[PDB]
């Protein structure tokens, strides 16, 4: 109700949804009154939208003589608010200013699905930067959805490769109840089973389950302890933290190695307070290095000179808990006035996903550029072929789109509009006495695994045989070494002529 927009004029207008405010509380969810202003997921992504469009307009190589504008709306990280604002996007399209050509975001995969179900109807291509659900890969259900992030399937794939490179052929599995945990754990099960890796037993739990529940989970994990020591955890951070708290409660710290998903990448809010339990853990962290020019632009911003971000003044007065004296959006209830010495440089922390926001914006730009070159060959600008822009053709060109990203990464979409994954493998090492910190140990680039080795742990069910493998009603990795007859030769690992005698190798 009663929402402002951040707009910028241009020949082509690109929409975007960012959670500039927290989602409503359960009382005010029906009134859709959102919470406080958000800096990293909000203000910074908004300013990045604006300044990246500035840069692309100033780029002569990319869309020459074509200006890109934008309509930026507040999603509140909530599906009701997001659907509201997307209806506001297609408002003008219904009656038949400057309709929306594409949309950037939103953040949550569920909210992204809700927005996609509406955007697909009016053939509006959507490019997301943090929604990683595998559900979004089905292009019969989400035809105009594309993302510049790898799906959770890539996290499962990278963990399977990590398990391969350390001969961890028998491991336990825990995942968090929900879309993330179950989708990722199913992908892990499939990929590890195809690679000859066995699961002792798979478990599932919510982060909010009691100390009761995590104690039961840790005891059941101990049930497998002699053989399966590595616990592949496709888990959001608080599940890992609960396992660490259970390891504290039972005194079982350091009898397992946890293989964490991106839900616990280098998040200190998970290991803080229980570092000693978590030491030795290996995690996956989505690689996204900081963008320098965004800091250059953003840190210079003053509320007196920001004449295009409507939320920037409540943001400023909430950041330094002061009162902008005599300003249009001056807020009372602050007990001090804002100094001219206040700067955003003070305790600055760039958004973790900034590179992905910027790459989604560049994806939209390069798609428009390639469409322009295919429909208006001899032109430098919009010809009548792109008046108006056919969302079908824009999707067709975006699926073909391919650039070099903000950090040098070549950005590219597969037949499902999915982007390849580059994560960095972290180790939560003990850095001396009473200091614990995450350490970059490796890199996983779209299947190519490189690890800065010698930084062991054995998790196998059975040892290799000498001269055949035979299995009971149990799993393929748990075998018994049964010898063969004197006239028999080893055909293969699992299964065992006249005038000849078995060779000295028993081949």
């Amino acid at each position: 109700e009663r929402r402002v927009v951040a707009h910028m004029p241009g020949d082509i207008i690109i929409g975007a949804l960012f959670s500039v405010h927290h989602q409503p509380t359960v009382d005010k969810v029906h009134e859709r009154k959102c919470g406080a202003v958000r800096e990293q997921y909000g203000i910074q992504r908004v300013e990045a939208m604006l300044h990246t469009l500035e840069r692309i307009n100033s780029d002569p190589t990319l869309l020459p003589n074509i200006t890109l504008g934008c309509e930026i709306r507040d999603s509140c990280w909530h599906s009701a608010v997001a659907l509201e604002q997307s209806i506001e996007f297609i408002r003008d399209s219904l009656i038949s200013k400057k309709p929306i050509v594409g949309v950037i975001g939103p953040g949550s995969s569920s909210v992204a699905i809700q927005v996609q179900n509406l955007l697909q109807l009016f053939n509006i291509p959507q490019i997301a930067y943090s929604a990683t659900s595998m559900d979004l890969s089905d292009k019969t259900l989400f035809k105009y959805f594309m993302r510049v992030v790898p799906s959770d399937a890539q996290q499962a794939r990278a963990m399977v490769d990590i398990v391969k490179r350390y001969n961890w052929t028998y491991v336990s599995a825990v995942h968090t109840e929900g879309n993330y945990g179950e989708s990722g754990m199913e992908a892990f099960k499939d990929m590890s089973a195809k690679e000859g890796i066995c699961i002792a037993h798979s478990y599932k739990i919510y982060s909010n389950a009691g100390e009761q529940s995590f104690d039961k989970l840790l005891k059941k994990l101990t049930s497998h302890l002699p053989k399966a020591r590595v616990v592949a955890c496709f888990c959001e951070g608080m599940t890992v933290r609960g396992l660490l708290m259970a390891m504290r409660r039972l005194g079982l710290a350091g009898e397992f190695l946890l293989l964490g998903s991106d839900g616990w990448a280098d998040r200190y809010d998970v290991t803080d307070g229980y570092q000693r339990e978590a030491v030795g853990g290996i995690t996956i962290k989505l690689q996204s290095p900081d963008v320098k020019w965004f800091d250059d632009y953003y840190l210079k911003l003053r509320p007196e000179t920001n004449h295009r971000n409507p939320w920037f003044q409540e943001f400023w007065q909430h950041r330094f808990q002061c009162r902008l004296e005599g300003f249009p959006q001056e807020n009372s209830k602050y007990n001090k006035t804002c100094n001219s010495s206040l700067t955003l440089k003070t305790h600055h922390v760039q958004d973790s996903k900034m590179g992905f926001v910027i790459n989604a914006i560049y994806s939209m730009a390069y798609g428009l550029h390639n469409m322009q070159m295919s429909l208006c060959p001899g032109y430098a600008g919009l010809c009548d072929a792109m008046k108006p822009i056919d969302g079908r053709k824009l999707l067709e060109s975006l699926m073909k789109t391919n650039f070099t990203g903000v950090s040098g990464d070549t950005i590219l979409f597969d037949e499902n509009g999915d982007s390849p994954g580059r994560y960095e493998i972290m180790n939560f090492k003990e850095m001396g006495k009473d200091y614990f910190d995450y350490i970059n140990v490796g890199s996983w680039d779209n299947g190519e695994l490189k690890m800065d080795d010698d930084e062991i742990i054995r998790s196998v069910c059975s040892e290799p045989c000498e001269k055949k493998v035979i299995r009971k009603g149990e799993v393929s990795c748990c075998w018994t070494c049964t010898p063969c007859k004197e006239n028999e030769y080893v055909f293969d690992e699992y299964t065992c002529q006249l005038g000849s005698w078995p060779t000295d190798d028993l081949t």
């Epitope: 109700e1 009663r2 409507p310 005599g326 300003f327 249009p328 807020n331």
Partner: nanobody, 123 residues
Framework: QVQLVESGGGLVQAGGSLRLSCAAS????????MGWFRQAPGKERESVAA????????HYADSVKGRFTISRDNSKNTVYLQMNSLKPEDTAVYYC????????????????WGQGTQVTVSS
């Protein structure tokens, strides 16, 4: 686009009181700070009063402090200028303006203007 429409002006005997109303169109009103202006013939336009988007933060020019009070009803999308102790040197067309960004008043970036209502202060 937002529309601003003034009303309440007319002829008023000096030393009297007069209340100007500014009605806005659109549900964005609660997001705009408001300012009153006045243009007298042969004189440059001056700022009279201003109020922030939330209300509860009012600013007045030195020539009208202690006589005018600016207010706003957000449930009605209306701004109000109560003018007391009217002097003949107040006779002018009063305008209503909406601004969203800007520095300390009167240095605001006014995005929308009204048509204006005449206030004639007879002696």
């Amino acid at each position: 686009q937002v529309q601003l429409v003034e009303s309440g002006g007319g002829l008023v005997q000096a030393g009297g009181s007069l209340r100007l109303s500014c009605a806005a169109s659109g549900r964005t009103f609660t997001s705009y700070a408001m300012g009153w202006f006045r243009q007298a013939p042969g004189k440059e336009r001056e700022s009279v009063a201003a109020i922030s988007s939330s209300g509860g933060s009012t600013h007045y020019a030195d020539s009208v402090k202690g006589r005018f009070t600016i207010s706003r009803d957000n449930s009605k999308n209306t701004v109000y200028l109560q003018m007391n102790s009217l002097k003949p040197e107040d006779t002018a067309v009063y305008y209503c303006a909406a601004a969203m960004y800007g520095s300390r008043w009167p240095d605001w970036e006014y995005d929308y203007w009204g048509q204006g209502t005449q206030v004639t202060v007879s002696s």
